[PDB]
Design a binder for this molecule. Structure first.
Ligand SMILES: Cc1cc2nc3c(=O)[nH]c(=O)nc-3n(C[C@H](O)[C@H](O)[C@H](O)COP(=O)(O)OP(=O)(O)OC[C@H]3O[C@@H](n4cnc5c(N)ncnc54)[C@H](O)[C@@H]3O)c2cc1C
Ligand SMILES: CCCCCCCCCCCCO[C@@H]1O[C@H](CO)[C@@H](O[C@H]2O[C@H](CO)[C@@H](O)[C@H](O)[C@H]2O)[C@H](O)[C@H]1O
Ligand SMILES: CCCCCCCCCCCCO[C@@H]1O[C@H](CO)[C@@H](O[C@H]2O[C@H](CO)[C@@H](O)[C@H](O)[C@H]2O)[C@H](O)[C@H]1O
Ligand SMILES: CCCCCCCCCCCCO[C@@H]1O[C@H](CO)[C@@H](O[C@H]2O[C@H](CO)[C@@H](O)[C@H](O)[C@H]2O)[C@H](O)[C@H]1O
Ligand SMILES: Cc1cc2nc3c(=O)[nH]c(=O)nc-3n(C[C@H](O)[C@H](O)[C@H](O)CO)c2cc1C
Ligand code: FES
Ligand code: FES
Ligand code: NA
Lengths: 204, 403, 197, 380, 407, 248
């Protein structure tokens, strides 16, 4: 066995750069590295568990009602993780906030559930969830770095660039806080990824 | 009757006198291979061969049965070839009076002639090449037919000769030619003219249509768009009035008629007028003793659409009825293109398709109705200085090839 | 009346794609060709106009607290119930494409199934429960959100078709420039930011 | 050694016009607005300064601002008796550095992309640089101008392949970047007059607060009449104020055929219709409802955008029918943002940007309808 | 557990209602039973197959066999079929190998096409008439250093029906074959001992199907001559597996048996009076030989015929005696050959170099009408790509050149 | 086959629903306790009283917070079990609540309780500050906040959102300490006794009396906060009570 499957979806098949999945969550939580980091962990854990369970029942999934089966696994796990967290570790439970809904609709969770879980054994399927969530977090956190540093002078809430509001020479950039900045930053990440990995460039 | 408002008449100095005179004697003539669209020649002559008036010089590999015959009797003095051995011209030195004759018929029988009989005489004599299909502006296939044959009895090109003056001298031949076209067409014959009067055909098949307005009004493509819109499955044939006179002469006298009246005009033409010459006449000899001193450009055809008559191409083109002489001197649409396009098209989008090479989209927008000359004005007014005539042929060649 | 205002909120002011940034994964994927983009937009309207009002009745009749019985609130069965309902329509939709599937089934491929799991569709149900919309308002809202989503996707497809004449660097070609194009589109949709209701 | 007819059939005559000549025409068309803008920029600043300070206090202010004592050094006077030479000179000290910064920073990106990608430099940047510099507040920091042009040139134009290959207006895209990234410097009461320590709302902000009667020049205490807004003797972006100057330049480029009169007509139609509709409906609370069309014309940047930016040929629709729709949407959107969007006093930049997104769709509806006529052979 | 029970049943009710609608929709929208596909409109050729699988799989099971080289990858495009109805529009990958004009006719790739509903097919006689036979090896002697002549004999006694330039698909199962098993003459063995190609051992993991052109003119009956080139790893990639099908053929000797799976091919001459020009290379000597033999006795053609074979050394040359007889017996046909690298002992005094430039510098350069000649080519891609470029530079239309590159 | 599909969907549906239903109902009780303890923790945090651990919060909250009931229609103290008053449940019943009109419902709240609990912070035997619960509809969920108003009845001492379901990063920034800390020192009313706290999109001018920066990229959630304060500080909310607080 090897780490190739884990690291494949980081830079070779990034779920947001090469594939088009999970973009909606990228634009909302990439305003902070803290929220982004928690979102990556949540997507990694859920994707891996859900992918694992679908593999167990892959041979038995009917294509007619596959989506229902796939969503039920994902929704049940997300609801339980939320309920378990609310009862114990309630402080963190508030942290999961609306991320219960935001992980169910993350296209990575269902996308890998059909492309991979349906055509792979559960053990390797789990590795797929960890790997895909990692690449999702590579993009999420890279965008989070620029948006938080340039838009707030802060990384993980720690002030790197002094703010004028605190007698600091740096004036924050307001566009980095809104959705469009993420669109532009992600596009430029794709540019860097596809200019260093020309294999992924789209044909003409 | 049909009035055109969107267009442009270039007011270039040196318009012809519109009086037919005799041009300088021509002792050299050629047929230009590259003019015929998609024509790959099968040569029937060699340098030094003696040829008759209507003797076959070469054949089209991709248009079997089409014979390109000599314009004059004489000797083959060269066969110019370019990159990849593309036939540029087959030059024949005029000499003698020999000709190949054909069947002759009475004027009252031409309208009643069998269609296959007309095609054979036209193909054997080489006059079949006068026809061009609109959807590709190629010589029609021998076995093909068209329900609509368009006669261009008008000339709105700058410095162009007046068709009425030429047609007036050959009224009987012109009427005889229309009768033949009446039998040749499956449908109707469209005589597209200006308001001026012309000899008329007694056949109900031959309908006269008047077009008035600026330059684009006189193009067969314009006439087809208004009378018989063309597509892949609706093919029209185009022929100009002087070829119609040639058709009438062939079926009345049984001989290939090769004389032509062309306007020699331009800013550097001392006495711009109409001159009698021959098909494929050498333009270097034709303009001799008629141009002002200096570095000038001889153009076969109009300045808008025409071939630079230099080197192997310094001969009158097959579809050209004028010689213009001039002195040698990114798709940002500001609304110039629409002003010169009277057709029901979105010209800026169409030209963008040609620039981008979107052949399928250009087909949807009406590229199939177009010849290069229909895009000459758009090329003229282009701030980016694109040459859309070339882009259109590239798109049309792509459609023919993939299609 | 009030309804026209609701329809205006869910099309322009609350454009799910360019204003709320919902459904970007399918929106940034099938955006190349107007005909395919229009087909997906039509299907999204079909899914949205059916998903929201049906979930509204189920929520108000079953999941609503103290609705089926007094003292029992099946609120915790909200996400699972809704996504399952959304998934069902998608499952029916896949077959329905088989009648009009050549034009979109081949192009959509993996994303036809992914319509379920679209931030746009789940979110619309959430707003129908986070807010209180009658059945008539749920239908007007659901149809309006879909139409606004279609306007954005069809618009992005128009822009991309226009880019046939563009000269995009390789590496940005396809997804990279599309993200930049969508970011630019969102910039111009921020004209409604102050608009309220 | 003998090219084929292809290369030889090129139209033997061409129109005198070229893209280079088109850009200079647009570049010259804004000179009247630009020159008045500098004159207006100095006049507004000098009046506010005398209204806020006098005596040695004014001298200290003049000494602590390089814009002021540089005008004194070159022969101008900061006193209220200053003539047009000193006012234009003072305004130049603000415009020229902005225009120079925008030209240099934006030009660097233009050449860099052409150099790396083996493209030849394009002259379209002349219009982008001048227009961007003439639509920013006079007090805009230079470092923000550099970023604004960088976003507009790179993100909006270059990454799409350069001039003629983008879909969004580059100059307005740059302004939007500064508008949303640094709103404090391009929105409010401290940026539209160059009198340090002066607070003044521009006309549109004032009408939205109270009414047309609230239209006052705080520095002079005199009411702002429609004539004032029309000529451009009002606070604002250097270049937008004078509707008269813009019309003079707009007339030339429209006459030359560089700017589309269908787009301009559409903008007016949309503005007049919607503003008149708001007038009839009325609103006892929203003062913007009662602004007539003729006031909308001479306020804000409506004139500059309609004449010099909505007419950006590349970002507009490519069909004559679409051009009307494109312009009407701009005019409707501008009034809507002006009237019913509290956040924004003017909405032209956002309005044009909104219309840029939908111009390609309008063309598609039109072009697909032509194909339906064509597939029917136009009923012939 | 009062609320737990109620939620569980209410959840199931919601799910049952949703699935029931889907199941109801499936019944009224998805076809049931088996899929019936009509082949050429003939009821006998109509195939009834259950839903699922690609078209290339269902057709092979029936009595009609469709030629395929890449298989279930949609790459070669030799499996194009005419779908009168069903199947929708052409997939984007298919367009890469099918032009739009062809799409109008209805051409589609069976492998790339997934069978899910009733479809209509019009397969031709050649594809329908495929017969599987297992010939007996007579000779497998080496013609050259890396070329072997195979004399496969049909056991049914009846000769093979095929056109000149055709080919037969050879199918073999998984099998491990060592190059040492090959028997080579001393002449070619010496060249082989320098690099020791006998060291290679091939292990075909799965059954394979390949194509091999014919080297017997039709009048030759009972024998399928074929010329086979041994497959060895690429000159630039030694770290590659050795030949699998060619190696298997080489391992065979007298008495061995192999399958031909019927004939196929689309390489043929034109029934006209135009001058013919042949350009052979390597294994290409099989189809070229059939053309020359076909045009000398099968047709007794008086048209001018020329042959230009590219060889590297005299050792590489084979079939020389047959070519000499045809040229001597009939003057209308003339053959020539040039050595790209003559051996020191060859002492060749004729043409030297590549036929790319040799043919031009000798015949086509002074030819008055090179375009008015039919050209047929078969050889290494370098020779073919270079030759066609030279022919194109002479104004030879593609319709006047037929290419049958074997790789 | 129909038989297999019904079996799997039913079986999968049952196991997953049982797990979800058991987790939600069973852990609900622990969740209910944890959430209640949080509100006492929030009231103390906004009050400026540091407490840590359930017993310290419960003990310090009971001693230091003086819940009282107030009638909004009159803004005067009333008698009831303030310590055990659930304003949320009351607002749902017409007996102890009213329905707001479209014009009146600035906070977008469907209903408003007739009587609402307030909390008095007492350093000694007197009120050093009053904490007022305000709620208004957000984009995704209702947002409930505590506002600590000084005895002046005008100055705001502290703000905290004790219930929110907005998206973290965008709308969940009502919990961000920097944003909450920005409220300290702001004034709820103008000279004319009209609501003046305004959420400024793009950032309020520094030092603003009534200017709090809005949540970046979260206009809808910021609108809810404005809508929350625009109603509860108004006539039908705590407006009358704050005038009375202001005079005594
Ligand atoms: C119409 C037609 C006629 C033909 N006629 C002939 C003919 O007369 N004679 C003839 O010899 N061939 C002919 N061929 C070619 C034939 O199809 C085979 O390519 C050939 O027989 C060699 O078979 P192979 O599978 O061993 O080659 P391959 O193994 O497919 O060739 C690949 C090359 O790399 C090596 N290799 C082997 N396995 C691998 C692997 N897994 N990955 C990478 N490299 C690998 C091989 O040694 C070889 O050098 C014809 C083909 C067609 C279409
Ligand atoms: C792709 C998305 C868009 C890409 C562009 C976004 C880039 C964002 C990072 C921009 C950072 C600029 O950072 C900025 O540097 C300038 C340079 O003096 C500083 O400028 C500071 O000093 C200058 C010196 O004259 C003063 O005039 C100015 O008033 C003051 O702010 C700013 O205080 C600082 O905030
Ligand atoms: C073809 C080229 C034409 C060139 C320009 C065309 C402009 C034509 C005029 C468009 C209509 C003007 O529209 C009319 O304008 C006047 C101001 O002048 C408005 O006059 C006023 O009336 C309303 C009363 O309701 C007031 O609230 C408000 O002060 C203003 O609107 C009228 O309400 C409006 O009905
Ligand atoms: C904010 C306001 C501005 C935006 C709103 C106004 C524009 C509305 C655009 C709607 C989308 C474009 O709609 C476009 O319409 C044309 C006809 O006009 C359709 O027409 C075309 O598609 C249909 C599909 O069935 C086919 O028959 C055929 O190819 C053609 O008719 C296009 O397929 C569709 O893409
Ligand atoms: C009439 C006209 C108007 C133009 N307006 C603008 C403009 O508003 N902004 C701009 O950046 N460039 C403008 N340009 C320059 C150029 O056309 C424009 O930037 C295109 O969007 C791409 O180069 C204009 C050019 C012309 C001819
Ligand atoms: S549609 Fe929202 S994550 Fe894909
Ligand atoms: S088997 Fe090769 S494309 Fe079908
Ligand atoms: Na406004």
């Amino acid at each position: 066995e090897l780490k190739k499957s884990v690291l494949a979806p980081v830079l070779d098949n990034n779920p947001i750069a090469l594939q088009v999945l999970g973009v909606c969550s990228a634009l909302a939580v990439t305003t902070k590295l803290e929220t982004a980091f928690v979102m990556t962990l949540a997507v990694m854990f859920v994707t891996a568990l859900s992918n694992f369970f679908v593999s167990l029942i892959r041979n038995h999934i009917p294509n007619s009602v596959r989506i229902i089966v796939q969503m039920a696994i994902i929704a049940s796990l997300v609801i339980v993780v939320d309920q378990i967290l609310k009862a114990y570790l309630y402080d963190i439970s508030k942290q999961l906030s609306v991320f219960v809904g935001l992980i169910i609709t993350n296209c990575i969770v269902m996308g890998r559930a059909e492309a991979f879980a349906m055509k792979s054994e559960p053990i390797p399927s789990f590795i797929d969830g960890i790997g895909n969530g990692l690449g999702y977090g590579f993009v999420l956190m890279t965008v989070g770095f620029f948006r938080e540093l340039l838009g707030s002078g802060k990384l993980f809430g720690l002030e790197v660039l002094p703010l004028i509001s605190n007698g600091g020479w740096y004036q924050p950039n307001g566009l980095m806080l809104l959705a469009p900045s993420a669109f532009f930053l992600i596009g430029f990440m794709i540019w860097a990824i596809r200019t260093f990995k020309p294999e992924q460039v789209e044909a003409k | 009757m049909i009035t055109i408002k969107k267009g442009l008449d270039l007011p270039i100095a040196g318009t012809p006198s519109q009086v037919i005179s005799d041009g300088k004697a021509i002792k050299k003539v050629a047929l230009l291979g590259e003019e015929y669209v998609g024509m790959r020649p099968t040569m029937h002559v060699r340098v030094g061969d003696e040829v008759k008036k209507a003797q076959i010089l070469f054949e089209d590999k991709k248009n079997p049965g089409v014979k390109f015959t000599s314009p004059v009797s004489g000797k083959v003095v060269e066969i110019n070839r370019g990159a990849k051995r593309v036939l540029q011209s087959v030059v024949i030195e005029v000499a003698g009076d020999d000709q190949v004759t054909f069947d002759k018929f009475e004027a009252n029988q031409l309208a009643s002639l069998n269609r296959d009989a007309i095609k054979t005489q036209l193909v054997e004599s080489g006059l079949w090449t006068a026809f061009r299909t609109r959807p590709f502006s190629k010589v029609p296939a021998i076995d093909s037919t068209s329900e609509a044959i368009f006669v261009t009895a008008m000339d709105t090109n700058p410095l162009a000769a007046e068709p009425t003056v030429v047609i007036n001298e050959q009224s009987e031949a012109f009427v005889a030619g229309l009768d033949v076209l009446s039998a040749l067409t499956t449908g109707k014959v469209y005589v597209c003219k200006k308001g001026t009067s012309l000899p008329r055909s007694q056949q109900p098949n031959v309908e006269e249509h008047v077009f008035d307005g600026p330059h684009p009004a006189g193009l067969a493509g314009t006439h087809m768009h208004f009378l018989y819109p063309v597509s892949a499955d609706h093919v029209a044939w185009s022929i100009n009035y002087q070829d119609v006179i040639a058709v009438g002469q062939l079926f009345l006298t049984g001989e290939l008629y090769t004389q032509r009246v062309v306007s020699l005009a331009g800013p550097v033409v001392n006495k711009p007028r109409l001159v009698r010459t021959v098909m494929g006449a050498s333009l270097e000899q034709l303009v001799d003793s008629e141009i002002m001193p200096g570095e000038v450009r001889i153009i076969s055809g109009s300045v808008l659409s025409g071939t630079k008559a230099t080197g192997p191409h310094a001969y009158l083109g097959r579809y050209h009825l004028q010689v213009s002489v001039l002195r040698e001197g990114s798709m940002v649409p500001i609304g110039n293109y629409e002003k010169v396009m009277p057709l029901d098209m979105e010209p800026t989008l169409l030209l963008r398709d040609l620039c981008a090479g979107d052949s399928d989209s250009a087909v949807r927008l009406g590229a199939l109705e177009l010849d290069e000359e229909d895009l000459a004005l758009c090329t003229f007014v282009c701030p980016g200085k694109y040459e859309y005539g070339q882009l259109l042929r590239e798109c049309l060649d792509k459609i023919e090839k993939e299609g | 009346e009030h309804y026209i205002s609701l329809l205006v909120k869910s099309i322009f002011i609350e454009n799910m794609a360019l204003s709320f940034f919902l459904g970007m994964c399918t929106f940034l994927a099938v955006s190349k060709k107007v005909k395919t983009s229009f087909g997906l937009g039509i299907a999204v309207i079909v899914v949205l106009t059916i998903s929201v009002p049906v979930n509204n009745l189920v929520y108000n009749l079953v999941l609503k607290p103290d609705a089926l019985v007094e003292g029992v609130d099946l609120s915790f069965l909200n996400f699972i119930t809704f996504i399952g309902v959304i998934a069902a329509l998608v499952q029916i939709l896949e077959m329905i494409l088989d009648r009009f599937f050549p034009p979109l089934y081949n192009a959509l491929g993996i994303f036809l199934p992914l319509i379920t799991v679209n931030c746009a569709i789940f979110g619309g149900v959430s707003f129908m429960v986070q807010r209180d919309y009658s059945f008539a308002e749920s239908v007007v809202y659901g149809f309006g959100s879909g139409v606004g989503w279609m306007l954005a996707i069809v618009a992005l497809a128009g822009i991309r078709e226009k880019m046939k004449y563009s000269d995009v660097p390789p590496g940005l070609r396809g997804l990279g420039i599309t993200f930049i194009t969508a970011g630019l589109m969102a910039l111009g949709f921020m004209s409604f930011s102050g608009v309220q209701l | 050694y003998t090219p084929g007819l292809v290369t030889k059939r090129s139209s033997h005559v061409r129109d005198s016009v070229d893209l280079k000549r088109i850009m200079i025409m647009v570049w010259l068309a804004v000179f009247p607005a630009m020159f008045w803008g500098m004159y207006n920029a100095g006049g507004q600043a000098i009046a506010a300064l005398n209204h806020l300070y006098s005596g040695d206090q004014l001298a200290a202010i003049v000494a602590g601002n390089w814009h002021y004592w540089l005008t004194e050094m070159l022969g101008g006077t900061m006193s209220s008796d200053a003539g047009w030479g000193s006012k234009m000179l003072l305004g130049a000290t603000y415009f020229l550095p902005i225009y120079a910064t925008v030209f240099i920073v934006g030009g660097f990106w233009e050449v860099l992309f052409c150099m790396v990608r083996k493209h030849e430099v394009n002259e379209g940047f002349f219009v982008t640089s001048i227009l961007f510099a003439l639509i920013v507040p006079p007090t805009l920091p230079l470092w923000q101008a550099a970023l604004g042009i960088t976003f507009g040139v790179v993100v909006a134009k270059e990454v799409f392949g350069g001039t003629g290959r983008n879909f969004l207006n580059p100059a307005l895209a740059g302004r939007a970047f500064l508008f949303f990234a640094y709103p404090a410097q391009i929105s409010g009461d401290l940026v539209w007059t160059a009198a340090d320590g002066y607070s003044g709302a521009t006309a549109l902000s004032q009408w939205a607060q109270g009414g047309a009667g609230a239209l006052i020049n705080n520095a002079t205490g005199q009411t702002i009449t429609w004539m004032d807004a029309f000529i451009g003797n009002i606070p604002g972006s250097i270049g937008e104020v004078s509707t008269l100057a813009l019309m003079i330049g707009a007339a030339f480029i429209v006459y030359m055929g560089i700017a589309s009169w269908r787009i301009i007509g559409g903008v007016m139609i949309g503005m007049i219709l919607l503003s008149t509709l708001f007038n009839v409906i009325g609103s006892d609370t929203n003062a913007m409802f009662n602004m007539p069309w003729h006031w909308h014309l001479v306020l804000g940047g409506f004139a500059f955008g309609m004449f010099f930016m909505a007419t950006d040929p590349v970002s507009a629709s490519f069909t004559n029918s679409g051009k009307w729709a494109y312009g009407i949407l701009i005019g409707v959107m501008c009034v809507l943002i002006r009237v019913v969007n509290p956040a924004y006093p003017e909405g032209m930049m956002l309005a044009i940007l909104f219309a840029n997104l939908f111009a390609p769709l309008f063309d598609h509806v039109v072009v697909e309808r032509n194909i339906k006529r064509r597939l029917a052979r136009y009923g012939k | 557990m009062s609320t737990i029970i109620f939620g569980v049943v209410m959840f199931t009710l919601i799910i049952l209602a949703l699935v029931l609608v889907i199941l109801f929709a499936k019944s009224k929208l998805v076809p049931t039973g088996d899929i019936t596909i009509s082949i050429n409109g003939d009821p006998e050729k109509a195939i009834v197959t259950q839903p699922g699988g690609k078209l290339l799989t269902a057709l092979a099971g029936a009595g009609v066999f469709v030629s395929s080289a890449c298989g279930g990858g949609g790459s070669c495009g030799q499996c194009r079929v005419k779908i009168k109805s069903g199947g929708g529009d052409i997939l984007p990958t298919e367009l890469d190998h099918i032009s739009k004009g062809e799409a109008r006719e209805g051409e589609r790739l069976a492998c790339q096409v997934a069978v899910k509903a009733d479809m209509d097919l019009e397969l031709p006689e050649e594809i329908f008439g495929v017969k599987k036979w297992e010939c007996t090896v007579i000779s497998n002697d080496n013609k050259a250093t890396f070329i072997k002549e195979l004399k496969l004999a049909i056991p049914d006694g009846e000769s093979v029906p095929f056109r000149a330039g055709g080919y037969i698909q050879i199918e073999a199962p998984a099998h491990h074959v060592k190059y040492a098993d090959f028997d080579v003459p001393e002449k070619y063995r010496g060249d082989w001992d320098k690099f020791n190609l006998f060291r290679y051992e091939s292990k075909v993991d799965e059954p394979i199907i390949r194509a091999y052109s014919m080297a017997n003119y039709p009048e030759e009956f009972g024998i399928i001559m074929l010329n086979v080139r041994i497959a060895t790893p690429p000159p630039n990639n030694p770290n590659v597996p050795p030949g699998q099908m060619s190696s298997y053929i080489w391992s065979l000797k007298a008495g061995d048996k192999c399958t031909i799976s019927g004939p196929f091919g689309e390489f043929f001459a034109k029934d006209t009076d135009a001058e013919m020009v042949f350009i052979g290379g390597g294994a290409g000597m099989a189809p070229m030989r059939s053309h020359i033999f076909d045009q000398l006795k099968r047709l007794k053609s008086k048209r001018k015929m020329s042959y230009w074979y590219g060889a590297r050394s005299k050792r590489e040359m084979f079939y020389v005696e047959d070519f000499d007889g045809l040229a001597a017996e009939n003057d209308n046909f003339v053959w020539h050959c040039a050595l790209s690298d003559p051996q020191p002992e060859d002492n060749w005094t004729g043409y030297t170099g590549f036929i790319h430039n040799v043919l031009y510098e000798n015949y086509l350069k002074d030819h008055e009408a090179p375009e008015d000649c039919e050209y047929y080519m078969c050889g290494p891609p370098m020779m073919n790509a270079a030759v066609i470029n030279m022919l194109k530079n002479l104004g030879v239309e593609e319709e006047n050149i037929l290419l049958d590159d074997f790789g | 086959s129909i038989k297999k599909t019904l079996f799997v969907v039913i079986a999968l549906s049952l196991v997953c629903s049982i797990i979800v239903s058991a987790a939600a109902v069973g852990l609900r009780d622990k969740q209910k306790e944890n959430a209640a303890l949080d509100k006492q923790s929030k009231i103390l945090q906004v009050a400026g009283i540091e407490a840590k651990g359930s017993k310290q919060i419960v003990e310090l909250f009971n001693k230091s917070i003086e819940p009282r009931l107030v009638d909004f229609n009159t803004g005067d103290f009333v008698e009831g079990d303030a310590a055990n008053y659930d304003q949320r449940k009351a607002a749902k019943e017409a007996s102890e609540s009213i329905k707001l009109t479209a014009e009146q419902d600035k906070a977008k709240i469907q209903r408003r309780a007739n009587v609402g609990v307030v909390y008095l912070v007492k350093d000694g035997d007197k009120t050093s500050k009053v904490i007022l619960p305000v709620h208004g509809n957000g984009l995704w969920s209702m947002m409930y906040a505590f506002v600590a108003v000084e005895t002046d009845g005008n100055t705001v001492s502290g703000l905290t959102y004790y219930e929110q379901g907005e998206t973290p990063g965008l709308g969940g920034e009502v919990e961000n300490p920097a944003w909450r800390a920005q409220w300290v020192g702001k004034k709820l009313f103008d000279e004319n006794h009209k609501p003046a706290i305004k959420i400024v999109k793009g950032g309020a001018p520094q030092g603003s009396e009534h200017g709090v920066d809005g949540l970046s990229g979260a206009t809808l959630t910021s609108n809810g906060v404005q809508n929350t304060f625009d109603f509860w500080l108004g006539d039908m909310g705590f407006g009358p009570f704050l005038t009375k607080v202001r005079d005594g």
